[PDB]
Amino acid sequence: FMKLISWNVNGLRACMTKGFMDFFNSVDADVFCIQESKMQQEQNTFEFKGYFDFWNCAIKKGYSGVVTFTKKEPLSVSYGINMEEHDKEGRVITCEFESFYLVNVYTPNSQQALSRLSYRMSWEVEFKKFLKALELKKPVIVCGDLNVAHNEIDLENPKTNRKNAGFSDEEREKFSELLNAGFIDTFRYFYPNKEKAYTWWSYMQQARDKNIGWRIDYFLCSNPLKTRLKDALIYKDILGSDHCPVGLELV
């Protein structure tokens, strides 16, 4: 089978000092995607032996940025969603493999008090169209930090967070609409009833020790890939970021 991993590392240089490479080497992923590199490829000093590495860096320094590491050479790689307005923040890398596209994405956060919600809505409209356009050729696997918790089971204090970024009605609706367009939330495909499964914890005192968190990191796949799925993973014990890694296994 193949093992795919995704991790918002909250700054790759920071995460490296907190053991990133130890988990990278240990999990031995066929494809390992990261979000929030917060660095430029030119300044990379780290070695990912045995992997191709593809970087997408923001114009703004020390901001956002994603990287895809893959053992297998892709058939093609693209960056962004082919819209200049949305392609300035180092957020999307798409690697084409033989039987699917793998889209690595760091979704724009709506920010405190939902100040960037209007832009986020425009992002969601275009991102969905981008994914459907890919599906004209091949099914799609999406992974990354999507900055949305879907249902009440997906975060610790639902009723007090509906005006916070990631759990607004507006964001939840776009994620529902994304799935209604033909995508599977793989973790909930295998574990629909699992409570307290989170991938992000705030800096509230001991939040992570108490597992007061949200699930906002995902693997999604086109409906026809359903029969190839083997498992969906949350690496809750891996430290080094305010997010933990997520994973997908398939044949």
Is residue 64 at the binding interface for Mn ion, with CB under 5 A as the rule? Answer: no
Please report how close the Cβ of residue 92 comes to Mn ion at its closest, in angstroms: 17
Residue 203 annotated to the active site: no
Task: Work out whether the CA dihedral 121, 123, 124, 126 comes out positive or negative.
Answer: positive
Bridge-based pairing of strands 66-70 and 52-56 is antiparallel
36 annotated as ligand-binding: yes
Report the residue number, 30 or 36, with the smaller CB distance to Mn ion: 36
Per-residue binding string, Mn ion, 15-54, x by CB under 5 A, is ---------------------x------------------
CA distance 244 to 240: 8
How many residues make contact with Mn ion (CB under 5 A)? Answer: 2
Task: Indicate the burial class of 67 (C-beta count within 10 angstroms; 0-12, 13-18, 19 or more).
Answer: buried
Catalytic residue among 51, 86, 101, 106: 106
Rounded to 5°, the CA angle 49-53-59 comes to: 140
Q: Is 8 annotated as a binding residue?
A: yes
Which one is catalytic: 30, 145, 185, 217?
145
**How many CB atoms neighbour CB 24 within 10 A?**
21
106 as an active site residue: the answer is yes
Phi, psi at 201, each rounded to 5°: -135, 135
145 an active-site residue? yes
Q: Which residue number, 36 or 185, has a Cβ lying nearer to Mn ion?
A: 36
Residue from the set 6, 10, 64, 164 that interacts with Mn ion by CB under 5 A: 10
R_g of the chain, CA atoms, integer Å: 17
Q: SS3 for 210? A: coil
Tokens of 236: 């809750």
Q: Give the separation between CA 216 and CA 146, rounded to whole angstroms.
A: 6
Query: Of 7-15, 18-26, 42-50, 75-83, which segment contacts Mn ion by CB under 5 A?
Result: 7-15
Between 84 and 203, CB nearer to Mn ion: 203
Q: Shortest gap between Cβ of 36 and Mn ion (angstroms)? A: 5
Q: Which residues belong to the active site?
A: 106, 145, 243
Residue set of the binding site for Mg(2+): 8, 36, 145, 147, 242-243
User: For binding to Mn ion (CB under 5 A), which residues are involved?
Assistant: 10, 36
